[PDB]
Symmetry: C2
């Protein structure tokens, strides 16, 4: 109550609003970086892979006598004079630049289309002084400076050139490669300015504007509080009343949250966000790493920098997901201490409301919010927005309304799914009008509405603290043009994915969404039928229902329609659980006909939930019951629950036609007390189902790896993840067994071989990432030496006769210097028991008798080379000599079999082979299971060349690799041209027949290509500056 | 081809395609029927009738 607090509020609020409007347009400081190619004055290939795929400018100028060492005798395999891609790549011709020599003409192919050409003896003339070339976003142009055309289609005497316009013909650069070796001549200057438009930094003026704007916003809200305390009333607390205490229900919810934090399924996007947050410190900005050309997360993701600071202690999965655990605890304590005692007296004194609020909270939290996504932030922000607004209405004060505006604008920019907070923002307009219209008669309009504007615009200092306005606008338009962006009428796709048979449409997610819709419909029907739900307050009940409906309507304007975007309803679900429990009791709903119909509806949506699989994501699915089939004991849970639903309808019809009630009949029993809360029983039954299913998944694979076993190992060191339980053989030529009779040639097909193909495999289908010891000419996988490994086969191009193969006797090693596996490699499509092992002792093989038989098992895509494996625990400890055996059961020419000799591999773990220092190309799924391995960096538009690659399993790799491909951005558009892959044998340490994924080596085409060095500078740019358009690959 | 009772979402998934099954006329008819039914149910709940 002072005039000074009425002047300070106006002045500070207007200054904060002006400094917030001004700050996206203030200058920055770009770091300019260009590539001048001849580094030390010699012909040497360099390696500079650009992340935006193209430079904003390119200029090469080759003299005449540079190409003197390009033609001569027939000892010249030297084709290219200059390139921006390695010529050995399959896609090198239709993506980059070449000044390659076709047989007698020196031509430069740019983006698959020729630009200029000339005969080579005319280039080596004393004319043709240059080979000027230039590339831009509108035209490319080449020119032989010195000569003209001859007797051809063009008239001679026109000074030969070539231009291509009307399309973006800029070449992709992954380095500058060549095929010469001498000292470089004069001239010969390639130059390219790299697009480092996001490598900015604030200037002094922008930094002072951000500091002064935040200070003025704080001073304006302090003056707003001094105005609000004019009526004589003091503080006396901040928190609710029963905050520092525990009950049994709080202990139960806390125990379920902690145990799900350890043995719990994770979401899909955790390695994505962890890899982004790990590389963003060296990059200097927050780039989206797997897609869209290195464009940043432009207004969204203010908290990824907090995750990047949080990850300096350790990158373990129990450490990185600990703020999400704290958000879940805070969310339930806000629900039970602030919302439920606010919704009335019948909601506050009843216990069934508390139990079903806890149940719907856990049923939304557990399948949907165990990760690094922005979903818990948005859920807790919607609750805190509603609680601040609801406290502003009661005490009739404006400062909690301004705090709610700050929190709502803060959670609006967590992710694109944060648009659900506009429900809690739009419901808070009527209350704000009611509060402002009461105070305006003694303070005014400016003094009450300038801190509201300052608090509304304080978030622009957080969005635009690193980027400019032009960068974020053009990047958002470009991401909408390139990537997957569905419109508002494609909202049915989210609900079509909810009803699939996949991890998107599993039991838990489907149950959560259908139970939310049921509780919302019952609350709306009881609000329409009576005036309100009877024992509850009017305003808060209305505002809960309105916020939930506007959240459902606002969720259709998101660019992607996924199923894990329903995790924003985890705070509203406890509130609707309390309302839908009060709306069902005998005090509110008086007829038992209606209560039996509601119980039947609960049973019907529970029946509809179990009509799918118990499927979870990538490695959360190991060992889980019913993870690939419908849950059933003998019939199916869905048919049993449908029968119970029909029986409940028949009981309701008998209640209808008999004309009977309950109030002088059933006072209280124990099952009658259990029966009146259908939502509590259904929600806690599904919560116990989920928790017990992942605990049993952890128990079924105990010596093998599981998610929960790694999270419980992490309490005692061992924070590497899956990298300790994957065995890797580097050299696949090491543990070959030795035969007893003839040497290592024909000893594969020693004693019986009819239909044996030493070159009898199809050369076209059998392919994986001369002369042989068997006379073979086939390609061997996994780095097998053709001079030591014989190959047989069972394929032919004529009429097919049956084939029987029977090997020689192979000596077995000692039982301490032997690995856990016996491996043969095999190609072709065949059945389970086609290839077998036949072990014997010394005297059993001297008598030529079987002695035993085990069968190989297989993991792999057929018909390509794969590894067949069998443990040595299946071979009894008295066996000394083994022998292979094979037979093809007809099935026409397409069916076949290929075979190599037996091998006991010498295995090391993946943490010892792939260390913690080499750059690894991780996929966007394999990020939280491999936390010790580091991804590759990028600093000024140039990326670091990886050495390894880790993939998911085959079903997961063939459906998720189009995120990272060439058509969307992606680092698989760079390594597709620069590097060649090579598979490595890898086995899961105790669950040998499981497809965990795969590992690859990445080898350069030119091994003598050093990294480049860039010439750095500093330029002061403005807030609307833009160097060049963003080229989209189409 | 015989789908079960829990495959009832497939009829609406076909209604929201871009094909002669999900054309303008059929989609308008079904959505207008659902709108009129919801308004009738809401007015029957709110008042007596
Ligand atoms: C195609 C993969 C999807 C989800 O499955 N990832 C969504 C993108 N992740 C966002 C941040 C988690 C970045 O835009
Ligand atoms: Ca055959």
């Amino acid at each position: 109550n002072h005039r000074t607090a009425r002047l300070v509020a106006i002045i500070a609020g207007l200054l904060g609003t002006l400094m917030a409007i001004a700050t996206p347009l203030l200058p920055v400081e770009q770091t300019t970086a260009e590539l001048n190619w001849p580094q030390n004055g010699v012909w040497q290939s360099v390696d500079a892979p650009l992340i935006g795929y193209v430079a904003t400018d390119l200029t090469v100028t080759v003299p005449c006598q540079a190409a003197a060492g390009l033609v001569g005798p027939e000892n010249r395999n030297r084709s290219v004079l200059l390139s921006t891609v390695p010529k050995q790549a399959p896609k090198a011709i239709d993506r980059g630049l070449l000044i390659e020599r076709i047989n007698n003409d020196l031509t430069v192919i740019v983006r698959n289309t020729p630009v200029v050409s000339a005969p080579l003896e005319q280039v080596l003339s004393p004319d043709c002084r240059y080979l000027t070339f230039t590339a831009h976003a509108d035209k490319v142009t080449g020119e032989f400076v010195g000569l003209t055309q001859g007797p051809d289609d063009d008239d001679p005497g026109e000074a030969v050139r070539g231009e291509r316009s009307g399309y973006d013909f800029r070449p992709q650069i992954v380095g500058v490669f060549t095929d010469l070796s001498g000292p470089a001549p004069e001239g010969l200057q390639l130059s390219a300015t790299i697009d480092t438009r996001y490598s900015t930094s604030p200037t002094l003026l922008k930094l002072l504007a951000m500091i002064v704007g935040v200070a003025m916003t704080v001073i304006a809200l302090g003056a707003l509080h001094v105005l609000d305390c004019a009526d004589g009333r003091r503080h006396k607390r901040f928190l609710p009343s029963r905050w520092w205490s525990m009950t049994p229900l709080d202990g139960l919810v806390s125990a379920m949250l902690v145990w799900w934090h350890f043995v719990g399924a994770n979401t899909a996007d955790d390695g994505y966000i962890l890899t982004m947050a790990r590389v963003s410190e060296h990059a200097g900005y927050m780039a989206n790493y797997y897609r869209w050309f290195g464009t940043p997360e432009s207004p969204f993701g203010w908290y990824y920098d907090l995750l990047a600071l949080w990850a300096h202690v350790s990158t373990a999965s129990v450490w990185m997901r600990f703020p999400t655990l704290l958000m879940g605890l805070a969310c339930w304590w806000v629900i039970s201490r602030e919302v439920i005692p606010r919704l009335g007296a019948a909601a506050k004194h009843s216990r069934a409301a508390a139990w079903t609020a806890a149940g719907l909270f856990l049923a939304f939290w557990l399948p949907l919010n165990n990760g690094l996504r922005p979903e818990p932030i948005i859920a807790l922000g919607i609750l805190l927005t509603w609680c601040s607004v609801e406290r502003g209405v009661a005490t009739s004060r404006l400062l909690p309304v301004a705090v709610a505006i700050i929190i709502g604008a803060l959670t609006l920019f967590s992710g694109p799914t944060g648009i659900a907070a506009v429900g809690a923002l739009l419901v808070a307009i009527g209350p704000l009008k009611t509060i402002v219209a009461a105070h305006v008669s003694r303070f005014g309009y400016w003094a009450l509405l300038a801190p509201i504007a300052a608090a509304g615009t304080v978030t622009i200092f957080l969005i635009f603290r690193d980027q400019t306005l032009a960068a974020e606008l053009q990047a958002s338009s470009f991401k909408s043009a390139v990537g997957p962006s569905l419109a508002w009428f494609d909202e049915h796709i989210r609900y079509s994915r909810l009803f699939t048979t996949s991890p998107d449409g599993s039991v838990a997610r489907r149950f959560a969404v259908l139970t939310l819709l049921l509780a919302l419909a019952v609350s709306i029907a009881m609000t329409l039928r009576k005036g309100r739900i009877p024992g509850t307050a009017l305003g808060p009940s209305r505002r809960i229902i309105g916020i939930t409906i506007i959240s459902f309507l606002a969720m259709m304007f998101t660019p992607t329609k996924w199923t894990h975007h329903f995790g924003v309803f985890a705070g509203l679900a406890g509130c609707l659980g309390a309302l839908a429990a009060v709306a069902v009791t005998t005090t509110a709903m008086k007829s038992r006909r209606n209560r039996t119909v509601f119980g039947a509806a609960v049973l019907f949506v529970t029946a509809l939930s179990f009509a799918t699989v118990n499927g979870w994501w990538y490695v959360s699915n190991f060992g889980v019951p019913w993870s690939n089939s419908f849950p059933e004991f003998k019939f199916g849970f869905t048919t049993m629950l449908l029968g119970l639903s029909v029986l409940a309808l028949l009981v309701a019809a008998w209640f209808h036609f008999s004309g009977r009630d309950v109030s002088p009949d059933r006072p209280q029993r124990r099952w009658q007390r259990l029966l009146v809360a259908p939502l509590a029983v259904a929600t806690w039954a599904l919560v116990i189902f989920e928790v017990v299913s992942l605990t049993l998944g952890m128990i079924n694979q105990y010596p093998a790896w599981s998610v929960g076993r790694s999270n419980l190992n992490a309490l005692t060191g061992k924070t590497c993840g899956l990298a300790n339980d994957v065995l890797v053989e580097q050299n696949a030529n090491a543990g070959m067994l030795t035969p007893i009779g003839e040497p290592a040639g024909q000893a594969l097909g020693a004693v019986t071989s009819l239909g044996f193909g030493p070159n009898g495999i199809p050369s076209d289908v059998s392919a994986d990432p001369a002369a042989g010891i068997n006379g073979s000419r086939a390609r061997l996988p996994y780095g097998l030496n053709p001079a030591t490994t014989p190959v047989l086969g069972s394929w032919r191009s004529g009429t097919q006769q049956p084939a029987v193969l029977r090997s020689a006797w192979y000596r077995l090693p000692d039982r301490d210097q032997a690995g856990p596996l016996l491996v043969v490699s095999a190609a072709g499509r065949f059945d389970q028991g086609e290839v077998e092992v036949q072990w014997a002792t010394d005297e059993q093989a001297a008598a030529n008798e079987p002695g035993g038989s085990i069968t190989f098992g297989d993991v792999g895509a057929a018909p390509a080379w794969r590894n067949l494996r069998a443990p040595l625990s299946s071979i009894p400890p008295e066996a000394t000599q083994i022998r292979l055996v094979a037979s093809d059961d007809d099935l026409a020419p397409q069916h076949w079999i290929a075979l190599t000799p037996p091998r006991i591999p010498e295995l090391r773990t993946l943490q010892e082979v792939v260390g913690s220092s080499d750059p690894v190309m991780l996929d966007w799924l394999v990020g939280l299971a491999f936390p010790c391995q580091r991804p590759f960096d990028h600093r000024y538009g140039v990326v670091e060349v990886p050495k390894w690659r880790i993939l998911p399993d085959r079903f997961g790799a063939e459906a998720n690799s189009p995120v990272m491909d060439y058509l969307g951005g992606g680092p698989l558009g760079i390594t597709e041209l620069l590097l060649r892959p090579s598979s490595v044998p890898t086995y899961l340490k105790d669950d040998w027949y499981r497809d965990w994924g795969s590992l690859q080596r990445l080898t350069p085409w030119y091994p003598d290509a050093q990294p480049a060095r860039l010439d750095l500078g500093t330029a002061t740019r403005s807030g609307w500056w833009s160097p060049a358009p963003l080229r989209l690959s189409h």
